[PDB]
Amino acid sequence: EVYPIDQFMNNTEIWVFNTTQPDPPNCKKDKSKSMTQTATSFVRSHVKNGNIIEENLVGNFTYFNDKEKVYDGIYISGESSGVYAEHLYYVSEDKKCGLFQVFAHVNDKTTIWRDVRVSGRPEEGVPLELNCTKEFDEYVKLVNATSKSPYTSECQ
């Protein structure tokens, strides 16, 4: 069914825990700032050559699903990795794990990938909901993609 991306993104820190993005930078995370009824303002952060880069972005809520009552996606203008749309298509029962379809365009090159994102700092001995990670693993096998985790406990 459909999970409110506006609720998932209303968390202090959302980390990219696993991704099929090719060669992803380390320590990818979003930090919420504020939301209106129709858009969220947030800081998208990652590390490049030891430097923390922070982009102040606006995600405009929209609908991938048919019934158009629950926001499940955002449009993004000017994102530095070329991501123009993100579709939240699954969230765990405990609301800590979310699966994303990511649509990107840079330099006459248009790509898609998928993420497991975690609504908080992952722990040492607390695994994510099994259906969440397994559904992602099913996709990774189906498209024969390579998956990587941008996260380490050393991430600021």
Numbering used by the authors: 48 to 203
Give verbatim excerpts from the published study on this entry:
CirpA1 targets human properdin, leading to potent AP inhibition. One protein, subsequently termed CirpA1, was shown to inhibit AP activation of the human complement system, while having no significant impact on the CP or LP at the concentrations tested. CirpA1 significantly inhibited the formation of both C3a and C5a via the alternative pathway suggesting it acts at the point of C3 cleavage. CirpA1 showed comparable activity in human and monkey sera (IC50 = 1.41 × 10−8 and 1.38 × 10−8 respectively) but only weak effects in rat serum and was inactive in guinea pig. Using this strategy, we were able to purify CirpA1, A3, A4, and A5 and determine their structure using X-ray crystallography to a resolution of 2.0, 2.1, 1.8, and 1.9 Å respectively. Overall, the structures appear very similar, with the biggest conformational differences in the tilt angle of the C-terminal helix H2 as well as variations in loops between beta strands 4 and 5 (L4-5) and between strands 7 and 8 (L7-8). Despite their high structural similarity (r.m.s.d. of 1.4 Å over 105 Cαs), OmCI and CirpA1 bind their targets in very different regions of the lipocalin surface. In addition, OmCI displays a second mechanism of function by binding the proinflammatory eicosanoid leukotriene B4 (LTB4) within an internal binding cavity. The corresponding pocket in CirpA1 is blocked by a cluster of charged residues, precluding binding of a hydrophobic ligand in this position. In addition, the CirpA family lacks the hydrophobic pocket seen in many lipocalins, suggesting that their mechanism of action is likely to be exclusive to their capacity to form protein–protein interactions.
In this study, we identify a family of complement inhibitors from the hard tick Rhipicephalus pulchellus, hereafter termed CirpA (Complement inhibitor from R. pulchellus of the alternative pathway). Functional and structural characterisation reveals that members of the CirpA family directly bind to properdin, inhibiting its ability to promote complement activation, and leading to potent inhibition of the complement response in a species specific manner. Whilst many molecules act to control inappropriate activation, Properdin is the only known positive regulator of the human complement system. All CirpA structures share a lipocalin fold with a short N-terminal α-helix followed by an eight-stranded beta-barrel and a longer C-terminal α-helix.
